Amino acid sequence: ERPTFYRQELKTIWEVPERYQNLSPVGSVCAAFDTKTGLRVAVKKLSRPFQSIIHAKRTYRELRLLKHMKHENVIGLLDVFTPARSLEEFNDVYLVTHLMGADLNNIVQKLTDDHVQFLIYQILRGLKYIHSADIIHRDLKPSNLAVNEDCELKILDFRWYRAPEIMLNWMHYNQTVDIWSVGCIMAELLTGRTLFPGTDHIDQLKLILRLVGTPGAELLKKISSESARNYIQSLTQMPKMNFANVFIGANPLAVDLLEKMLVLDSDKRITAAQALAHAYFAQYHDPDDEPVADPYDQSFESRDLLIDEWKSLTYDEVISFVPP
């Protein structure tokens, strides 16, 4: 049976099941109390969800993704509703997720090594799942990582932390773009400072290469553009620094892990699954409690449909939603 909804203004009018109380603003988002569960939640009212073909497809994309994610370290979907009673009336979409405490920016007085391990382990646990569904986050950074009091972490959403190959539009990449990002995050947790605080994309790459070294003949062989090759090999040859002397006093196993994540060639970069079995995580790792995802069907991405069809497909997804 359909809940009872009530209506309220806070620019626009919000129409939500009565189980959600004390909406205070934070599309646009309100913090809410979910009376059914006692949880504090975030209710997002999508703005303009079907204004165009692009809006519609993005609406469908976000809803499908959030429905797929079912993992402790990844934001999932608590509820999705519409005030509409039919496809005819369907104009509004609300998403309900866990209201998350801080993010990792708020946390950045250093963190102990034990606590760095705990945070990074959880990110890698979430990333192993996301990547096992063939999804690449692409923009992992402190503001996309929320923690509660217990300091339990969830990945949300989906340029100091971007892999150089994602930064530079290179088609030679894989899911370990996210692993570069984790390396930058982990480093900043150990030292209190941004690893690569570039001013523009050039300054950023110069800071990266200063630490990792200019590409070696082997990586140069994977570069298909002559102007790109000529560009690279014209730069002054930086040799790979030793990380120990950049992360002084850090746990030697953290430093070793950093050297494996912060590798320019992504075919050689450590993966989320490999990183979880690294000794640095010995107190937290458990290979029977690092679950993987169902395969995630992104064929919709290649389709060009009418507005009314993306709208209908979205409505289908609302209707079939099953809560946790």
Coordinates of C-alpha atoms in Angstrom, one line a residue, residues 57-211:
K57 CA 19.3 9.4 -18.8
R58 CA 21.3 10.8 -15.8
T59 CA 18.3 10.4 -13.5
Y60 CA 18.0 6.8 -14.7
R61 CA 21.8 6.3 -14.4
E62 CA 21.9 7.5 -10.7
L63 CA 18.9 5.5 -9.6
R64 CA 20.2 2.3 -11.3
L65 CA 23.7 2.6 -9.7
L66 CA 22.4 3.3 -6.2
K67 CA 20.0 0.4 -6.4
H68 CA 23.0 -1.9 -7.4
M69 CA 25.3 -1.0 -4.5
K70 CA 24.9 -3.2 -1.5
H71 CA 28.0 -3.1 0.6
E72 CA 29.1 -1.8 4.1
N73 CA 31.7 0.7 2.7
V74 CA 29.6 2.1 -0.2
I75 CA 26.6 4.4 0.1
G76 CA 23.4 2.4 -0.8
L77 CA 19.8 3.3 -1.4
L78 CA 17.6 3.3 1.8
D79 CA 14.4 4.3 -0.1
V80 CA 13.2 5.9 -3.3
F81 CA 9.8 7.5 -3.7
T82 CA 7.6 9.7 -5.8
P83 CA 4.3 11.5 -4.8
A84 CA 2.9 10.4 -8.3
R85 CA 0.3 7.6 -8.4
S86 CA 0.8 6.7 -12.0
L87 CA 3.3 7.1 -14.8
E88 CA 1.1 9.9 -16.1
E89 CA 1.6 12.0 -12.9
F90 CA 5.3 11.1 -12.5
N91 CA 7.4 14.2 -12.4
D92 CA 9.4 14.0 -9.2
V93 CA 12.0 11.6 -7.7
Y94 CA 13.4 11.4 -4.2
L95 CA 16.3 9.4 -3.0
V96 CA 16.9 8.5 0.6
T97 CA 20.4 7.5 1.9
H98 CA 22.2 7.3 5.2
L99 CA 22.9 10.8 6.7
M100 CA 26.6 10.6 7.0
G101 CA 28.6 12.3 9.8
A102 CA 31.8 14.0 8.6
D103 CA 33.8 13.5 5.5
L104 CA 37.6 12.8 5.4
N105 CA 38.4 16.6 4.9
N106 CA 37.0 17.3 8.4
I107 CA 39.5 14.7 9.8
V108 CA 42.6 16.1 7.9
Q109 CA 47.4 16.7 14.7
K110 CA 48.0 13.5 12.7
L111 CA 46.1 10.2 12.7
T112 CA 47.8 7.2 14.3
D113 CA 49.1 4.5 12.0
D114 CA 46.4 2.2 13.4
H115 CA 43.7 4.6 12.4
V116 CA 45.2 5.3 8.9
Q117 CA 45.2 1.5 8.4
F118 CA 41.6 1.3 9.4
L119 CA 40.4 4.1 7.1
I120 CA 42.4 2.9 4.1
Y121 CA 41.4 -0.7 4.6
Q122 CA 37.7 0.3 4.5
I123 CA 38.2 2.4 1.3
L124 CA 39.9 -0.6 -0.4
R125 CA 37.2 -2.9 0.8
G126 CA 34.5 -0.7 -0.8
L127 CA 36.7 -0.3 -3.9
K128 CA 37.1 -4.1 -4.3
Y129 CA 33.3 -4.4 -4.4
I130 CA 32.7 -1.3 -6.8
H131 CA 35.5 -2.5 -9.1
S132 CA 34.2 -6.2 -9.1
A133 CA 31.0 -4.8 -10.8
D134 CA 33.1 -3.1 -13.5
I135 CA 32.5 0.4 -12.1
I136 CA 35.4 2.9 -11.9
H137 CA 34.8 5.7 -9.4
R138 CA 37.1 8.2 -11.2
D139 CA 37.0 11.0 -8.7
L140 CA 37.8 9.5 -5.3
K141 CA 38.9 12.3 -2.9
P142 CA 38.5 13.1 0.8
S143 CA 35.1 14.9 0.3
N144 CA 33.7 11.6 -1.3
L145 CA 34.4 9.6 1.8
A146 CA 32.1 9.9 4.8
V147 CA 32.7 8.5 8.2
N148 CA 30.5 8.1 11.3
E149 CA 31.6 8.4 15.0
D150 CA 32.7 4.8 15.2
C151 CA 34.8 6.0 12.2
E152 CA 33.1 3.5 9.9
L153 CA 33.6 4.7 6.3
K154 CA 31.4 4.8 3.2
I155 CA 32.3 5.8 -0.4
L156 CA 29.8 8.3 -1.9
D157 CA 29.2 9.9 -5.4
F158 CA 30.6 8.3 -8.5
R159 CA 42.1 17.6 -9.0
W160 CA 44.9 16.8 -6.4
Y161 CA 43.8 13.1 -6.2
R162 CA 43.2 12.2 -9.9
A163 CA 45.4 9.7 -11.6
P164 CA 47.7 11.3 -14.2
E165 CA 46.2 9.2 -17.0
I166 CA 42.5 10.3 -16.1
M167 CA 43.8 13.9 -15.7
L168 CA 45.4 13.8 -19.1
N169 CA 42.7 12.1 -21.2
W170 CA 44.8 8.9 -21.9
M171 CA 42.8 5.9 -23.0
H172 CA 45.4 3.6 -21.4
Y173 CA 43.7 3.1 -18.0
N174 CA 41.8 0.6 -15.9
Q175 CA 40.1 0.6 -12.6
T176 CA 43.5 1.4 -10.8
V177 CA 42.9 5.1 -11.5
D178 CA 41.1 4.9 -8.2
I179 CA 44.1 3.2 -6.6
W180 CA 46.3 6.3 -7.5
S181 CA 43.7 8.4 -5.7
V182 CA 43.8 6.1 -2.6
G183 CA 47.6 6.5 -2.6
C184 CA 47.2 10.3 -2.5
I185 CA 44.6 10.1 0.3
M186 CA 46.6 7.7 2.3
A187 CA 49.8 9.9 2.0
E188 CA 47.9 12.9 3.2
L189 CA 46.6 10.9 6.2
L190 CA 50.2 10.0 7.2
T191 CA 51.8 13.5 6.8
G192 CA 48.9 16.0 7.3
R193 CA 49.7 17.7 3.9
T194 CA 48.4 17.3 0.3
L195 CA 50.7 15.0 -1.6
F196 CA 50.4 16.9 -5.0
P197 CA 48.9 20.3 -4.4
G198 CA 49.2 21.4 -8.1
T199 CA 48.0 24.9 -9.2
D200 CA 47.0 23.7 -12.8
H201 CA 47.3 20.4 -14.6
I202 CA 50.9 21.2 -15.6
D203 CA 52.1 22.1 -12.1
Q204 CA 50.3 18.9 -10.9
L205 CA 52.1 16.6 -13.4
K206 CA 55.4 18.2 -12.6
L207 CA 54.9 17.5 -8.8
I208 CA 53.9 13.9 -9.6
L209 CA 56.9 13.2 -11.9
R210 CA 59.2 14.8 -9.4
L211 CA 58.2 12.0 -7.0

